[PDB]
């Protein structure tokens, strides 16, 4: 493996199913090369905002490590996957640092994730005691006691379950349709550069 390999970006952008945003998936990309032209010359993307790197320039740069974070969110919630943004997703589900270096890629996935009758497999976290630190993942499903009475592990009056389904139907508005999101994090540290363009 320590001898010139192709970065397995396929199992990220092209996976059959994505993870819910509260349990966002992360794959570490290391020691490999990739032709980023196939990425920035693709028209299948509705959001391709880069921060700190020029998109069309990814083949001319090398990086120590690359992190690909992937999940599914609502359409109107895509704008929160950006440095300095706040909201339900940025505060409680997935948060980018103010100094983020990388690109935020998103495309409509109603054809892949919506079902007549509603697809409720994708969820998000409604609340959290404090906002998420950058690149922090919270998968806790503990029922919160917001009242006087102990909850004993069941939903109730002031006994809330921290996660809720999205409810994806094919007839929802675009702003309410599922969108698949990939967050590429390029790390240029003091280590030797491994993930290069070509």
């Amino acid at each position, epitope marked *: 493996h320590h001898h010139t390999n192709l970065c397995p970006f396929g199992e990220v952008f092209n996976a059959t199913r994505f993870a819910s945003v509260y349990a966002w998936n992360r794959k570490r990309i290391s020691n490999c090369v990739a032709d980023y032209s196939v990425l920035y010359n693709s028209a299948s993307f509705s959001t391709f905002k880069c921060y700190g790197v020029s998109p069309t320039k990814l083949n001319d740069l090398c990086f120590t490590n690359v992190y690909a974070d992937s999940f599914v969110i609502r359409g109107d919630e895509v704008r929160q996957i950006a440095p300095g943004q*706040t*909201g339900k997703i940025a505060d409680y589900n997935y948060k980018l640092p103010d100094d983020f270096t990388g690109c935020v890629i998103a495309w409509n996935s109603n054809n892949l994730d919506s079902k007549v009758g509603g697809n409720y497999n994708y969820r998000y976290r409604l609340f959290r005691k*404090s*906002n998420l630190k950058p690149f922090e993942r919270d998968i806790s499903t503990e029922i919160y006691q*917001a009242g*006087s009475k102990p909850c004993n592990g069941v939903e109730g009056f*002031n006994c809330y379950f921290p996660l809720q389904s999205y409810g994806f139907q094919p007839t929802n508005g675009v702003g309410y349709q599922p969108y698949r999101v990939v967050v590429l994090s390029f790390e240029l540290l003091h280590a030797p550069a491994t993930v290069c363009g070509k």
Partner: antibody, heavy 125, light 109 residues
Framework: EVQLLESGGGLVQPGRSLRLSCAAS????????IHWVRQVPGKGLEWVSG????????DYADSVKGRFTISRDNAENSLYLQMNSLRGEDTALYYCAKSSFPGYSSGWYYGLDVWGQGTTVTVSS | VVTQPASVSGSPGQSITISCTGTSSDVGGYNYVSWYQQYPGKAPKVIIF???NRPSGVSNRFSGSKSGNTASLTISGLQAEDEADYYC??????????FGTGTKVTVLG
């Protein structure tokens, strides 16, 4: 039950000082964010201030910034809206509200579901 | 500045809509719009959160929508018990929240 009760209002002269207090019960005050909202009698609402569960984040309306200061004591389940440089425009009914969920801005995301009865502050000479 | 109509009236059974126009830093940028129903001498009641979702126990006669920079609370089948003041509210880019001017809803008849 979830309950918020306000105290410490009354009369105050222009420029002078006054302190309000908000008592909480029936929920874990130690991990919630509370806000202050005021209401001109006979007219419409306006937000005042907010404080996180650990006081690490604090915001104020521009009409009261520099003049107002919020603070909390989680050991006493109490929230304070210290008030002065009071003007005639500061005469209102002052509410103490929170959301159903923990989270600083969660009050704005899902709404402020629990309010207090309020406390009247009258600014006259 | 979040502007609402000063007063909105309607007869019983009729349907009325309160508007709530804001900027791009409030009602226009975030789907965090909430409506409140205030009877005289009582605290505001949450009627709508996130434009359209209603709290448990709220009459489904209360619908909420948003278009660009303007939220809309819709009361269908006006009942006499709906005569109150209605306030919209929204999150701001400053991480604050702001309230609307209010709307005196008066059921006629």
């Amino acid at each position: 039950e979830v309950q918020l009760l306000e105290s410490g209002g009354g009369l105050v002269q222009p420029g002078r000082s006054l302190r309000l207090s908000c008592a909480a019960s029936g929920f874990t005050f130690d991990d919630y964010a509370i806000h202050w909202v005021r209401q001109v009698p006979g007219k419409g609402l306006e937000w005042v201030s907010g404080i996180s569960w650990n006081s690490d984040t604090i915001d104020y309306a521009d009409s009261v910034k520099g003049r107002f200061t919020i603070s909390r004591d989680n050991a006493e389940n109490s929230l304070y809206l210290q008030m002065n440089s009071l003007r005639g425009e500061d005469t209102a009914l002052y509410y103490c509200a929170k959301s159903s969920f923990p989270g600083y801005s969660s009050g704005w995301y899902y709404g402020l579901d629990v309010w207090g009865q309020g406390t009247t502050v009258t600014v006259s000479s | 500045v979040v502007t609402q109509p000063a007063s909105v009236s309607g007869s019983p059974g009729q349907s009325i809509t309160i508007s709530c126009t804001g900027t791009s830093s409030d009602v226009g940028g975030y789907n965090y719009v909430s409506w409140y129903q205030q009877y005289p001498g009582k605290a505001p009641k949450v009627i709508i959160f996130e434009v359209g979702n209603r709290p448990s126990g709220v009459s489904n006669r209360f619908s909420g929508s948003k278009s660009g920079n303007t939220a809309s609370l819709t009361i269908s089948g006006l009942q006499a018990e709906d005569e109150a003041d209605y306030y919209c509210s929204s999150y701001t880019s400053t991480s604050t929240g702001v309230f609307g001017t209010g709307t005196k809803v008066t059921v006629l008849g």
